[PDB]
Coordinates of all heavy atoms in Angstrom, one line a residue:
Chain A
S2 N 173.2 77.3 234.4 CA 172.5 77.5 233.0 C 172.0 79.0 233.1 O 171.6 79.5 234.1 CB 171.4 76.6 232.8 OG 170.2 76.9 233.5
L3 N 172.0 79.6 231.9 CA 171.5 80.9 231.6 C 170.5 80.9 230.5 O 170.7 80.5 229.3 CB 172.6 81.9 231.2 CG 172.2 83.2 230.6 CD1 171.5 84.1 231.7 CD2 173.5 83.9 230.0
Chain B
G55 N 180.3 95.8 243.8 CA 180.3 94.8 244.8 C 180.2 93.3 244.2 O 180.3 93.1 243.0
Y56 N 180.1 92.4 245.1 CA 180.0 91.0 244.7 C 179.4 90.1 245.9 O 179.5 90.5 247.0 CB 181.3 90.4 244.4 CG 182.5 90.7 245.3 CD1 182.7 89.9 246.6 CD2 183.3 91.8 245.1 CE1 183.7 90.2 247.4 CE2 184.4 92.1 246.0 CZ 184.6 91.4 247.1 OH 185.6 91.6 248.0
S57 N 178.7 89.1 245.5 CA 178.2 88.1 246.6 C 179.4 87.2 246.8 O 180.4 87.2 246.2 CB 177.1 87.3 246.0 OG 177.4 86.5 244.9
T58 N 179.2 86.4 247.9 CA 180.4 85.5 248.2 C 180.5 84.2 247.4 O 179.5 83.7 246.9 CB 180.4 85.2 249.8 OG1 180.3 83.8 250.1 CG2 179.3 86.0 250.6
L59 N 181.7 83.9 247.0 CA 182.1 82.8 246.2 C 181.9 81.6 247.2 O 182.5 81.5 248.3 CB 183.5 82.9 245.8 CG 184.1 81.7 245.1 CD1 183.4 81.5 243.8 CD2 185.7 81.9 244.9
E60 N 181.0 80.7 246.8 CA 180.6 79.5 247.5 C 180.0 78.5 246.8 O 179.8 78.7 245.6 CB 179.6 80.0 248.7 CG 178.3 80.5 248.0 CD 177.3 81.1 249.0 OE1 177.6 81.8 250.0 OE2 176.1 81.1 248.7
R61 N 179.8 77.3 247.6 CA 179.0 76.2 246.9 C 178.3 75.5 248.1 O 178.6 75.7 249.2 CB 179.8 75.3 246.1 CG 180.9 74.6 246.9 CD 181.6 73.5 245.9 NE 182.5 72.8 246.7 CZ 183.4 71.7 246.3 NH1 183.2 71.3 245.0 NH2 184.1 71.0 247.1
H62 N 177.3 74.7 247.7 CA 176.4 74.0 248.6 C 175.7 73.0 247.8 O 175.6 73.2 246.6 CB 175.6 74.9 249.3 CG 175.1 76.0 248.5 ND1 174.3 75.9 247.5 CD2 175.4 77.4 248.6 CE1 174.1 77.1 246.9 NE2 174.7 78.0 247.5
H66 N 170.1 77.0 243.4 CA 169.5 78.3 243.3 C 168.7 78.5 242.0 O 169.3 78.2 240.9 CB 170.7 79.4 243.2 CG 171.3 79.7 244.5 ND1 170.7 80.3 245.5 CD2 172.5 79.6 244.8 CE1 171.5 80.6 246.5 NE2 172.6 80.1 246.2
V68 N 167.5 81.6 240.1 CA 167.8 83.1 240.1 C 167.2 83.8 238.8 O 167.2 83.3 237.8 CB 169.3 83.4 240.2 CG1 169.6 85.0 240.0 CG2 169.8 83.0 241.5
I70 N 167.3 87.7 237.3 CA 167.8 89.2 237.4 C 166.6 90.1 237.5 O 165.6 90.2 236.6 CB 168.8 89.5 236.3 CG1 169.9 88.5 236.3 CG2 169.4 90.9 236.7 CD1 170.7 88.1 237.5
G75 N 175.3 92.8 235.2 CA 176.6 92.4 235.8 C 177.0 91.1 235.3 O 176.8 90.8 234.1
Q76 N 177.7 90.3 236.1 CA 178.2 89.0 235.6 C 178.1 87.9 236.7 O 178.1 88.4 237.9 CB 179.7 89.1 235.2 CG 179.9 89.9 234.0 CD 181.3 89.7 233.4 OE1 182.4 89.8 234.0 NE2 181.4 89.4 232.1
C77 N 178.0 86.7 236.3 CA 178.0 85.6 237.2 C 179.0 84.6 236.9 O 179.3 84.3 235.6 CB 176.7 85.1 237.5 SG 176.0 84.4 236.1
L78 N 179.6 83.9 237.8 CA 180.3 82.7 237.6 C 179.5 81.5 238.1 O 178.9 81.6 239.3 CB 181.7 82.7 238.5 CG 182.4 81.4 238.5 CD1 183.1 81.1 237.2 CD2 183.3 81.3 239.7
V79 N 179.2 80.6 237.2 CA 178.5 79.4 237.6 C 179.4 78.2 237.2 O 179.6 77.9 236.0 CB 177.1 79.3 237.1 CG1 176.4 78.0 237.5 CG2 176.4 80.5 237.5
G80 N 180.0 77.5 238.0 CA 181.0 76.4 237.8 C 182.2 77.0 237.0 O 183.0 77.5 237.7
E81 N 182.3 76.7 235.7 CA 183.5 77.2 234.9 C 183.0 78.3 233.9 O 183.8 78.6 233.1 CB 184.2 76.1 234.2 CG 184.8 75.1 235.1 CD 185.1 73.8 234.5 OE1 185.4 73.8 233.2 OE2 185.2 72.8 235.1
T82 N 181.7 78.7 234.0 CA 181.2 79.6 233.0 C 181.0 80.9 233.5 O 180.3 81.2 234.5 CB 179.8 79.1 232.4 OG1 180.0 77.7 232.2 CG2 179.4 79.7 231.1
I83 N 181.5 82.0 232.8 CA 181.3 83.4 233.3 C 180.3 84.0 232.3 O 180.6 83.9 231.0 CB 182.5 84.3 233.3 CG1 183.5 83.7 234.4 CG2 182.2 85.8 233.6 CD1 184.9 84.3 234.3
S84 N 179.1 84.5 232.8 CA 178.1 85.1 231.8 C 177.8 86.5 232.2 O 177.9 86.9 233.3 CB 176.8 84.2 231.9 OG 177.0 82.8 231.8
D85 N 177.4 87.2 231.2 CA 176.7 88.4 231.3 C 175.3 88.2 231.7 O 174.6 87.4 231.1 CB 176.7 89.2 229.9 CG 178.1 89.8 229.5 OD1 179.0 89.8 230.3 OD2 178.2 90.3 228.4
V86 N 174.8 89.0 232.6 CA 173.4 88.9 233.1 C 172.8 90.3 233.1 O 173.4 91.3 233.5 CB 173.3 88.2 234.5 CG1 173.8 86.9 234.5 CG2 173.9 89.0 235.5
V92 N 168.9 82.3 235.8 CA 170.1 81.6 236.0 C 169.7 80.4 237.0 O 169.1 80.6 238.0 CB 171.2 82.4 236.7 CG1 172.4 81.6 237.1 CG2 171.7 83.5 235.8
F93 N 170.2 79.2 236.6 CA 170.0 78.0 237.5 C 171.4 77.6 238.0 O 172.3 77.4 237.1 CB 169.3 76.9 236.8 CG 169.0 75.8 237.7 CD1 168.1 75.8 238.7 CD2 169.9 74.6 237.6 CE1 167.9 74.9 239.5 CE2 169.6 73.5 238.5 CZ 168.7 73.6 239.4
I94 N 171.5 77.4 239.3 CA 172.8 77.0 239.8 C 172.7 75.5 240.4 O 171.9 75.4 241.5 CB 173.4 77.9 240.9 CG1 173.3 79.3 240.4 CG2 174.8 77.4 241.4 CD1 173.9 80.3 241.4
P95 N 173.3 74.5 239.8 CA 173.1 73.2 240.2 C 173.9 72.8 241.5 O 174.7 73.6 241.9 CB 173.5 72.3 239.0 CG 174.4 73.2 238.2 CD 174.1 74.6 238.5
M97 N 176.5 71.8 244.4 CA 177.9 71.7 244.7 C 178.8 72.3 243.6 O 179.6 71.7 243.1 CB 178.4 70.3 245.0 CG 178.0 69.9 246.4 SD 178.6 70.8 247.8 CE 180.3 70.3 247.8
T98 N 178.3 73.5 243.2 CA 178.8 74.2 242.0 C 179.2 75.6 242.5 O 178.4 76.3 243.0 CB 177.8 74.2 240.9 OG1 177.4 73.0 240.5 CG2 178.2 75.2 239.7
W99 N 180.5 75.9 242.3 CA 181.0 77.2 242.7 C 180.3 78.4 241.9 O 180.0 78.3 240.8 CB 182.6 77.3 242.5 CG 183.4 76.4 243.4 CD1 184.1 75.4 243.0 CD2 183.5 76.6 244.7 NE1 184.7 74.8 244.1 CE2 184.4 75.6 245.2 CE3 183.0 77.5 245.7 CZ2 184.7 75.4 246.6 CZ3 183.4 77.3 247.1 CH2 184.2 76.3 247.4
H100 N 180.0 79.5 242.7 CA 179.3 80.6 242.1 C 179.5 81.9 242.9 O 179.7 81.9 244.1 CB 177.7 80.3 242.0 CG 177.1 80.0 243.4 ND1 177.0 78.8 243.9 CD2 176.4 80.8 244.2 CE1 176.4 78.8 245.1 NE2 175.9 80.1 245.2
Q101 N 179.4 82.9 242.1 CA 179.6 84.3 242.6 C 179.0 85.3 241.5 O 179.0 84.9 240.3 CB 181.1 84.5 242.7 CG 181.4 86.0 243.0 CD 182.7 86.2 243.7 OE1 183.8 85.7 243.0 NE2 182.9 86.8 244.8
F102 N 178.3 86.4 242.0 CA 177.7 87.4 241.2 C 178.5 88.7 241.4 O 178.8 88.9 242.6 CB 176.3 87.6 241.5 CG 175.3 86.6 241.1 CD1 175.2 85.4 241.8 CD2 174.6 86.7 239.9 CE1 174.3 84.4 241.4 CE2 173.7 85.8 239.6 CZ 173.5 84.6 240.3
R103 N 178.7 89.4 240.4 CA 179.5 90.7 240.4 C 178.8 91.8 239.8 O 178.4 91.6 238.8 CB 180.9 90.6 239.8 CG 181.8 89.6 240.6 CD 183.3 89.6 240.1 NE 183.7 91.0 240.1 CZ 184.9 91.4 239.5 NH1 185.6 90.5 238.8 NH2 185.3 92.6 239.6
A104 N 178.7 92.9 240.4 CA 178.1 94.1 239.9 C 179.4 94.8 239.2 O 179.7 96.0 239.6 CB 177.5 95.0 240.9
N105 N 179.9 94.2 238.2 CA 181.1 94.7 237.6 C 181.0 95.3 236.3 O 181.9 95.3 235.4 CB 182.2 93.6 237.5 CG 181.8 92.5 236.6 OD1 180.5 92.3 236.3 ND2 182.7 91.7 236.1
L110 N 173.4 95.5 240.7 CA 172.8 94.2 240.2 C 171.9 93.8 241.2 O 172.4 93.4 242.3 CB 173.9 93.3 239.9 CG 173.5 91.9 239.4 CD1 172.8 92.0 238.1 CD2 174.7 91.0 239.4
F112 N 168.9 90.8 242.1 CA 168.3 89.5 241.6 C 167.5 88.8 242.6 O 167.6 88.9 243.8 CB 169.4 88.5 241.2 CG 170.5 88.2 242.1 CD1 170.3 87.1 242.9 CD2 171.6 89.0 242.2 CE1 171.4 86.7 243.8 CE2 172.7 88.6 243.1 CZ 172.5 87.5 243.8
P126 N 185.5 78.7 250.1 CA 186.5 78.0 249.5 C 187.7 77.9 250.4 O 188.0 78.9 251.2 CB 186.9 78.9 248.3 CG 186.2 80.2 248.5 CD 185.1 79.9 249.4
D130 N 190.9 74.7 247.4 CA 189.8 75.1 246.5 C 190.2 76.3 245.7 O 190.2 76.2 244.4 CB 188.6 75.5 247.3 CG 187.8 74.4 247.9 OD1 188.0 73.3 247.4 OD2 187.2 74.5 249.0
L131 N 190.8 77.4 246.3 CA 191.1 78.5 245.6 C 192.2 78.3 244.6 O 192.2 78.8 243.4 CB 191.6 79.7 246.5 CG 190.4 80.4 247.3 CD1 191.0 81.4 248.3 CD2 189.5 81.0 246.4
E133 N 192.9 75.4 243.2 CA 192.3 74.6 242.2 C 191.5 75.5 241.2 O 191.6 75.3 240.0 CB 191.4 73.6 242.9 CG 190.8 72.5 242.0 CD 191.8 71.6 241.3 OE1 193.0 71.7 241.5 OE2 191.4 70.8 240.4
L134 N 190.7 76.4 241.7 CA 189.9 77.3 240.9 C 190.8 78.2 240.0 O 190.5 78.5 238.8 CB 189.0 78.3 241.7 CG 187.7 77.7 242.2 CD1 187.1 78.6 243.3 CD2 186.7 77.5 241.0
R135 N 191.9 78.7 240.6 CA 192.8 79.7 239.9 C 193.6 79.1 238.8 O 194.3 79.8 238.1 CB 193.6 80.5 241.0 CG 192.8 81.5 241.7 CD 193.5 82.0 243.0 NE 192.8 83.1 243.6 CZ 193.0 83.4 244.9 NH1 193.9 82.8 245.7 NH2 192.4 84.5 245.3
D137 N 192.4 77.9 236.2 CA 191.8 78.5 234.9 C 192.0 80.0 235.1 O 191.6 80.7 236.0 CB 190.3 78.1 234.9 CG 189.6 78.9 233.8 OD1 190.0 80.0 233.2 OD2 188.5 78.4 233.5
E138 N 192.7 80.6 234.1 CA 193.1 82.1 234.2 C 191.9 83.0 234.1 O 191.9 83.9 234.8 CB 194.0 82.4 232.9
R139 N 190.8 82.6 233.3 CA 189.6 83.5 233.3 C 188.8 83.4 234.7 O 188.4 84.5 235.1 CB 188.7 83.0 232.2
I140 N 188.8 82.4 235.3 CA 188.2 82.3 236.7 C 189.0 83.0 237.7 O 188.6 83.7 238.6 CB 187.9 80.9 237.1 CG1 186.8 80.2 236.1 CG2 187.3 80.8 238.6 CD1 186.5 78.8 236.6
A141 N 190.4 82.9 237.7 CA 191.3 83.5 238.5 C 191.2 85.1 238.5 O 191.2 85.7 239.5 CB 192.7 83.2 238.2
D142 N 191.0 85.6 237.3 CA 190.7 87.0 237.1 C 189.4 87.5 237.6 O 189.3 88.6 238.1 CB 190.8 87.4 235.6 CG 191.6 88.5 235.3 OD1 192.9 88.5 235.3 OD2 191.0 89.6 235.3
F143 N 188.4 86.6 237.5 CA 187.0 87.0 237.9 C 186.7 87.0 239.3 O 186.1 87.9 239.9 CB 186.1 86.1 237.2 CG 184.7 86.4 237.4 CD1 184.0 87.3 236.5 CD2 183.9 85.9 238.5 CE1 182.7 87.7 236.7 CE2 182.6 86.3 238.6 CZ 182.0 87.0 237.8
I144 N 187.1 85.8 240.0 CA 186.7 85.7 241.4 C 187.1 86.8 242.4 O 188.2 87.3 242.2 CB 187.0 84.3 242.0 CG1 188.5 84.1 242.0 CG2 186.4 83.2 241.0 CD1 188.9 82.9 242.9
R145 N 186.3 87.0 243.4 CA 186.7 87.8 244.4 C 186.5 87.2 245.8 O 185.5 86.7 246.2 CB 185.9 89.2 244.4 CG 186.2 90.0 243.1 CD 187.5 90.8 243.3 NE 187.8 91.6 242.1 CZ 188.3 91.2 240.9 NH1 188.5 89.9 240.8 NH2 188.4 92.2 240.0
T146 N 187.6 87.2 246.6 CA 187.6 86.6 247.9 C 187.5 87.7 248.9 O 187.1 87.3 250.1 CB 188.9 85.8 248.2 OG1 190.1 86.8 248.1 CG2 189.1 84.7 247.2

Side-chain angles (χ1 to χ4, degrees), chain A residues 2-3, chain B residues 55-62 66 68 70 75-86 92-95 97-105 110 112 126 130-131 133-135 137 140-146:
Chain A
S2 76
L3 169 64
Chain B
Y56 46 83
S57 68
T58 121
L59 176 63
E60 66 186 26
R61 63 174 185 179
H62 36 64
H66 280 295
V68 173
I70 311 303
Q76 289 195 311
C77 61
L78 171 75
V79 180
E81 289 164 33
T82 316
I83 295 164
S84 313
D85 284 351
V86 304
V92 174
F93 185 68
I94 312 183
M97 287 295 291
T98 298
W99 289 115
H100 58 276
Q101 173 162 55
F102 287 81
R103 292 189 57 194
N105 65 338
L110 175 64
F112 56 93
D130 287 329
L131 287 177
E133 187 67 3
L134 280 165
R135 286 168 173 161
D137 171 343
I140 299 184
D142 223 85
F143 182 92
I144 64 165
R145 294 284 184 280
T146 62

